[PDB]
From Swiss-Prot:
Annotated source species: Homo sapiens (Human)
The name this protein goes by in its record: EEF1A lysine methyltransferase 3
One GO process term, biological-process aspect: peptidyl-lysine methylation
EC number(s) per entry: 2.1.1.-
Gene: EEF1AKMT3
Main location: cytoplasm
Length: 203
């Protein structure tokens, strides 16, 4: 069969997001909009998360949907994935982000390419990116590097114990991050975590 695309339509925060998913062309999981992405976008809407002027990076963006919403909300956004997904992401940026929006696309293979990015992002985003246990230390170190001292990380995941999500969120991440369960969507079984660099306590 020919490769083909499917469009999925969304309206978040009053903006149109028309997201192309490129199937049959060997993107694998990067082609799909997964469930925690929708949850995270709905949370940015419901909580009126402020992106205006903030320096934002998305990891494992897939289609780019979350980072696109951040850019529509006024963020200065860098949307990243492996090289295989970047053309898809770029298409979705071109389709959705207006002239005054800021959304660049770059490769960032976790724990390999993080040192060609600065260490000064205000917001670091990841939806459906906690699923490959052998990658966990690479992701951890990437998060550490990107998030500026007073920055915030948002991670949204469908909870699946057999892929290591509890290990990640309940063992690895809390060691050096102050971690909040920002929201649990019981129906979707998606948790949204907010993380900040762990602070030594003064007393
Ligand atoms: N080592 C790695 N470095 C960078 N991105 C990676 C990676 N391993 C997996 N990914 C990316 O992580 C994504 C997981 S699928 C989730 C895509 C999207 N954020 C969504 O929630 O819908 C894929 O696009 C995949 O290519």
């Amino acid at each position: 069969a020919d490769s083909y695309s499917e469009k999925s339509q969304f309206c978040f925060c009053g903006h149109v997001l028309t997201i192309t998913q490129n199937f049959g062309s060997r993107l694998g999981v990067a082609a799909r909009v997964w469930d925690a992405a929708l949850s995270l976008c709905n949370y940015f809407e419901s909580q009126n998360v402020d992106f205006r002027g903030k320096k934002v990076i998305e990891l494992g963006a897939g289609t780019g949907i979350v980072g696109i919403l951040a850019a529509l909300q006024g963020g200065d956004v860098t949307i990243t994935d492996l090289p295989l997904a970047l053309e898809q992401i770029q298409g979705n940026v071109q389709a959705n982000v207006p002239a005054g929006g800021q959304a660049q696309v770059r490769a960032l293979s976790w724990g390999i390419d993080h040192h060609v990015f600065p260490a000064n992002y205000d917001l670091v985003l990841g939806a459906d990116i906690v699923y490959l246990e052998p990658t966990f230390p690479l992701l951890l170190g990437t998060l550490q590097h990107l998030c500026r001292p007073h920055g915030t990380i948002y991670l949204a995941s469908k909870m699946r114990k057999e892929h290591g999500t509890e290990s990640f969120f309940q063992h690895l991440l809390p060691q050096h991050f102050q971690l909040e369960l920002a929201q649990r969507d019981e129906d979707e079984n998606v948790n949204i975590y907010r993380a900040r660099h762990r602070e030594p306590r003064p007393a």
